Design a protein around this ligand. Structure first.
Ligand SMILES: [Zn+2]
Ligand SMILES: [Zn+2]
Length: 123
């Protein structure tokens, strides 16, 4: 986990999300606001942990895919209020190989974010 790694992870998340949301829905993505969206993920992590399980590097793929059902794209800068699609809607239309990468990207983003709600509670 690192600030520079998180930027690359977030940009991967947006690139895949954007390409799939655009062709699925016919609507065009908006400009990113990375800090706004990482704020959204910061608020989401505790909800995901209560509704599904604690996020650790060994969390099973099925628990991550279920967390994607509780992540609404309308919450983020690049899809802001455009449709009610959730992250699993993009997952469901990837091929098997692309699916594995998306799960890893979404899990590693949640771990990098969580590594920061952590730093923000240290005195
Ligand atoms: Zn394209
Ligand atoms: Zn901002």
């Amino acid at each position: 986990a690192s600030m520079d790694k998180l930027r690359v992870l977030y940009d991967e998340f947006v690139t895949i999300s954007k390409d799939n949301l655009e062709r699925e829905t016919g609507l065009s993505a908006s400009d990113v606001d990375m800090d706004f969206d990482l704020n959204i993920f910061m608020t989401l992590v505790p909800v995901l942990e209560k509704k599904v399980c604690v996020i650790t590097p060994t969390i099973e793929d099925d628990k991550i895919v279920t967390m994607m059902k509780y992540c609404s794209y309308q919450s983020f800068s690049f899809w802001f209020l455009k449709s009610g699609a959730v992250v699993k809607s993009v997952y469901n239309k990837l091929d098997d190989v692309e699916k594995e990468k998306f799960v890893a990207t979404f899990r590693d983003m949640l771990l990098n974010v969580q590594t920061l709600i952590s730093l923000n509670s240290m005195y």
